[PDB]
Symmetry: D3
Subunit: 172 residues, 6 copies
Amino acid sequence: YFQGMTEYKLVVVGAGGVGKSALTIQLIQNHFVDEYDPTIEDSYRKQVVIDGETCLLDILDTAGHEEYSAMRDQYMRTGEGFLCVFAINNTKSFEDIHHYREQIKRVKDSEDVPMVLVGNKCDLPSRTVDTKQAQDLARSYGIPFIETSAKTRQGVDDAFYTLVREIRKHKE
Amino acid sequence: YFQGMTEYKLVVVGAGGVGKSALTIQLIQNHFVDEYDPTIEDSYRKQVVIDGETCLLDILDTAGHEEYSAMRDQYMRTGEGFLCVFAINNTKSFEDIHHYREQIKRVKDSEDVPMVLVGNKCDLPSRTVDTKQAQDLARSYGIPFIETSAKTRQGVDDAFYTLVREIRKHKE
Amino acid sequence: YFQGMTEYKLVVVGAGGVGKSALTIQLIQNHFVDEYDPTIEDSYRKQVVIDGETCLLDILDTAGHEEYSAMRDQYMRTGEGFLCVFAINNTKSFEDIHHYREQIKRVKDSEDVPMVLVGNKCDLPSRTVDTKQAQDLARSYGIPFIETSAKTRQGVDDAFYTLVREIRKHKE
Amino acid sequence: YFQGMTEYKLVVVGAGGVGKSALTIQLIQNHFVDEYDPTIEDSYRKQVVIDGETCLLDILDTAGHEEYSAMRDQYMRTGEGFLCVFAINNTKSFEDIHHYREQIKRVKDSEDVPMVLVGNKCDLPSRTVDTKQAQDLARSYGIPFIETSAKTRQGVDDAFYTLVREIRKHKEK
Amino acid sequence: YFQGMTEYKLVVVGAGGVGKSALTIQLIQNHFVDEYDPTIEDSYRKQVVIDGETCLLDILDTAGHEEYSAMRDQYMRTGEGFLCVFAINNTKSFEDIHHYREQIKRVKDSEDVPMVLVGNKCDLPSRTVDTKQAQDLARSYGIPFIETSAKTRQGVDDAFYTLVREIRKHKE
Amino acid sequence: YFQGMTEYKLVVVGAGGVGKSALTIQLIQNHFVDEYDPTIEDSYRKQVVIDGETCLLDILDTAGHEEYSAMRDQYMRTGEGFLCVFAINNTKSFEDIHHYREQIKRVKDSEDVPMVLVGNKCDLPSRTVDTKQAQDLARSYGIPFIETSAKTRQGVDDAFYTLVREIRKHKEK
Ligand SMILES: Nc1nc2c(ncn2[C@@H]2O[C@H](COP(=O)(O)OP(=O)(O)NP(=O)(O)O)[C@@H](O)[C@H]2O)c(=O)[nH]1
Ligand SMILES: Nc1nc2c(ncn2[C@@H]2O[C@H](COP(=O)(O)OP(=O)(O)NP(=O)(O)O)[C@@H](O)[C@H]2O)c(=O)[nH]1
Ligand SMILES: Nc1nc2c(ncn2[C@@H]2O[C@H](COP(=O)(O)OP(=O)(O)NP(=O)(O)O)[C@@H](O)[C@H]2O)c(=O)[nH]1
Ligand SMILES: Nc1nc2c(ncn2[C@@H]2O[C@H](COP(=O)(O)OP(=O)(O)NP(=O)(O)O)[C@@H](O)[C@H]2O)c(=O)[nH]1
Ligand SMILES: Nc1nc2c(ncn2[C@@H]2O[C@H](COP(=O)(O)OP(=O)(O)NP(=O)(O)O)[C@@H](O)[C@H]2O)c(=O)[nH]1
Ligand SMILES: Nc1nc2c(ncn2[C@@H]2O[C@H](COP(=O)(O)OP(=O)(O)NP(=O)(O)O)[C@@H](O)[C@H]2O)c(=O)[nH]1
Ligand SMILES: O=C(NC[C@@H]1COc2ccccc2O1)c1ccco1
Ligand SMILES: O=C(NC[C@@H]1COc2ccccc2O1)c1ccco1
Ligand SMILES: O=C(NC[C@@H]1COc2ccccc2O1)c1ccco1
Ligand SMILES: O=C(NC[C@@H]1COc2ccccc2O1)c1ccco1
Ligand SMILES: O=C(NC[C@@H]1COc2ccccc2O1)c1ccco1
Ligand SMILES: [Mg+2]
Ligand SMILES: [Mg+2]
Ligand SMILES: [Mg+2]
Ligand SMILES: [Mg+2]
Ligand SMILES: [Mg+2]
Ligand SMILES: [Mg+2]
């Protein structure tokens, strides 16, 4: 019997200051946060319809730099899909993506974990990471790539919905 | 790729005056039709969410007594699920059910066609068909039975949603 | 910041066979379950709007007779509000109500636990519990009383929504 | 040109105790009010979809017996459609309907005011007004008749939605 | 009597590669398609609310590279309104709008067909068609102009909704 | 007892041509108005959900330059919250903001009126008001600042929703 909507546990990861919180708050509250208030751990929920199916998104917004490592392992084990976020004006955040992806694969003991690569801050003019380099990286992982802006909303719904679609593909 | 909601083609059949139209209009318009205006053929649409899936119901309301028999065969071939309606104060309408069911199975060349047995007018005091007799008939067919009232709305959404659930079970 | 809708943890309690599951399934699925399948423990969820506020209902459907008593204490501690259900044609289930209420107050160590008294099966003709006696019982507890039918849907939404309203009053 | 949904100003009238408030509260809150708390004047709002059109219902719940008569005239002038409610177990409330209808036509200075006749408390066994008599009365006025119960919800949405449909028919003539 | 929502048959036309499919998929899926997969003929549906009226959009996505087909004329004649799409960085696509407008008038056998002029890819730096030139063209036809980006979503809902508004104006 | 959704009376003010109407029509109709049709006074409504609470926005779109002054005073008294709009390519419109805020405070006889500063036309290239100057101004007033574009929709929902959030904060003090 149907016991209520499907829930998806989504985790947003990436380096400090890339816009993990701003992405999530834009999704939930339709609000752009201009301030930089570093996150420890915050959880949000939103019911949405994707490809005709109602679902409840449970979104965990993580800290760029996780001090205690057992807490990080716990959210990686609980997460069903991951947004791996870098900022298109921060080359170091892009170089860090490989580390986040390896950490997730290690903790979940899986090679095929639903993930989407997200290049955020696409509204800003001083781009240091080229679209082609990110697309190549995503292709090498077999995952989608989406450019976003938490300020203009470009790609925000698409990033989260794409991740749900990746989870659903993996569940069949 | 998703191109739009799933559509379900539902056909409402049964003897003259059992409340086929009244059931459908209660579903679509939240309106009870007190008048008895015999139907020739009418089609209705409604988008609903059932078990978290969005769907488009295409509902064909049929005549109690079909003049052209080729037109009847055509809607039987086209329909994916059937509500077989009798009135709980009309014994003849209940005895007629087996004819509608045989016609449908013949045309579809199948013993497992999605169907729901509907005992309508359950608000009226003059009952001549017992719940147990209808339940036994439905059990013999392997289909659900639901008592309805187009006037009180008892069972109306449930009849249609149950039929969609029967179609989905058959498709998988 | 708002992190998504408010969640309410609702627990449905009462004697065996009074319609705990049937009420919950009518709420969630718009479906009347005619079969009597005794419950061990089932959980359901639904998003609804009550008094203009969006909320997520988490509903725990319990067994009439709880064997292991630590498991019962655990759901009573976790529940924020309780529907105490009897059947209007079952005097014993009505006389039992005070036991359920005492068990809840004992475990929660409180005299002011959000609760609603529910008299189910109000569609049936064989009534043995008078509405006035139920209202008097509810008045003695300081809680609302609602007559319901899981078959007709009378009062079903009202029972759950009223319970949410009781929870909100207690939280403020 | 479109400035937001269409608004319909609905007024609920009828004798004391027929269930005007209970109908409205069932519509708005999905709650049956068992208590009898006499109304002075209350206003409620709900956004609904009727025949594919989104609309905002502004509903004025009136007192059975109106003290100040200028205030009654004011809501009758402002109202676009009226639910005229009686209780099916209260013959006197049914006999009163013609007075409410006449008062509305007088104030609005019109013979063609959108209205629906509502026979409430249809869940109760003690019926004293026959459906044939109510149907005849409604036919004589050229308006719909609907039996309702604020307790079971029978006919509640239908009464209000039917009234909106009557208003729309009148606006298109 | 109301039998369910109004349906509008929309057709999206324009030169190869202008973003007809990308616009439609952004509408339906909230997804930007980066790949260029040439279309032959694809159909989508979506229920939306426009000016307070619920409607069902039936959307036909066409080929931009297609020699003369009787089969093309046949599907175009089902259209009630047309999005005529060019890319703001492709002057030839803008000059081709005259050909699509003549094709539509020919197939519909009418001078007054609901249409909207859509200038897509407004996010790109390589603009060759100025806003004022497109506005002047649209004014000459007596139709609206909307600038869009299937990547940012600028103007996507507005293009389709505007077309529905044009259809409604024509029907009254 | 709940009688239907809460209504918020929002007023959009600012110099002529800054995009007051364009913002409102983007919110209501999802439509970008490219034409410049100067407003006299128009009212719009929209039901929205903000922070899980359903509400009805009643939005008054005002004229840049209000000729008869009693009509302006009346909407300022009635309004619960104000969007103060300038265009990021029009320095004069930004210099006007302080005066619109003072006019609102004078009419309402209060120092603490819910308001949001809106910098519109952020899609256009010829910016003359820098983000930092607007943020500083907003900070000096203790109000939020949001950059918007009625063309791209950037910030449109956020401006209106933020204003409702400011009204709710003020009602809870
Ligand atoms: N222009 C622009 N600024 C952005 C965007 N996303 C985030 N920002 C800004 O970048 C800063 C950091 O954003 P924030 O959400 O807090 O980043 P975070 O990744 O959650 N940081 P942490 O790891 O400390 O929790 C903030 O000043 C924010 O406004 C964007 O897409 N565009
Ligand atoms: N009391 C009550 N009356 C009902 C109910 N359903 C239908 N009726 C009434 O029964 C009569 C016949 O209803 P109708 O829907 O037209 O029947 P039908 O099966 O569509 N007739 P046909 O086959 O000629 O199209 C109408 O007067 C209607 O008001 C019900 O559930 N309860
Ligand atoms: N007529 C009618 N029958 C009802 C209603 N509610 C429940 N029933 C019936 O009463 C029986 C028991 O219902 P059920 O929901 O299983 O009760 P329960 O309280 O969950 N049983 P348990 O404690 O064993 O889990 C079933 O046959 C069901 O159809 C009602 O409102 N009216
Ligand atoms: N059984 C049943 N009782 C009803 C129904 N509608 C109203 N009642 C009851 O009848 C009483 C009067 O209802 P109420 O809504 O206050 O009537 P009213 O017409 O608003 N009275 P007034 O004009 O004084 O404001 C209440 O006790 C209420 O529970 C109904 O449909 N069925
Ligand atoms: N940057 C940008 N690229 C776009 C935009 N719309 C479409 N594209 C890109 O342009 C290419 C062609 O788009 P597509 O939608 O397939 O074009 P079409 O008009 O459907 N082509 P056909 O007629 O062959 O079906 C794709 O690579 C797509 O990503 C847009 O608004 N901006
Ligand atoms: N590019 C761009 N143009 C805009 C934007 N907002 C408004 N405009 C344009 O600026 C002009 C004025 O907008 P309008 O909404 O009428 O301004 P207003 O503040 O309501 N004027 P008034 O005070 O006379 O009523 C219009 O041509 C409109 O298209 C925007 O965000 N971006
Ligand atoms: O709810 C929280 N975290 C608990 C878990 C961890 O992993 C999760 C992974 C994905 C989504 C939700 C998760 O929820 C939380 C922290 C701070 C506030 O809420
Ligand atoms: O719609 C109609 N017929 C076409 C077909 C028939 O079978 C169907 C079966 C189920 C649902 C729709 C159907 O539509 C129709 C004739 C008269 C009024 O509507
Ligand atoms: O859901 C479950 N338990 C977790 C908790 C306990 O207390 C609850 C109290 C109220 C509502 C839900 C509850 O859910 C559960 C076990 C087995 C099936 O569902
Ligand atoms: O709301 C009130 N009156 C003002 C007007 C009158 O006519 C109306 C007609 C229909 C809907 C609302 C109306 O509102 C009111 C007084 C007391 C409580 O509410
Ligand atoms: O609606 C109007 N005025 C009445 C009032 C005034 O202040 C208001 C402030 C905010 C929202 C609605 C208001 O509406 C109106 C005149 C012209 C067009 O609409
Ligand atoms: Mg953060
Ligand atoms: Mg019929
Ligand atoms: Mg049970
Ligand atoms: Mg009252
Ligand atoms: Mg294509
Ligand atoms: Mg204006």
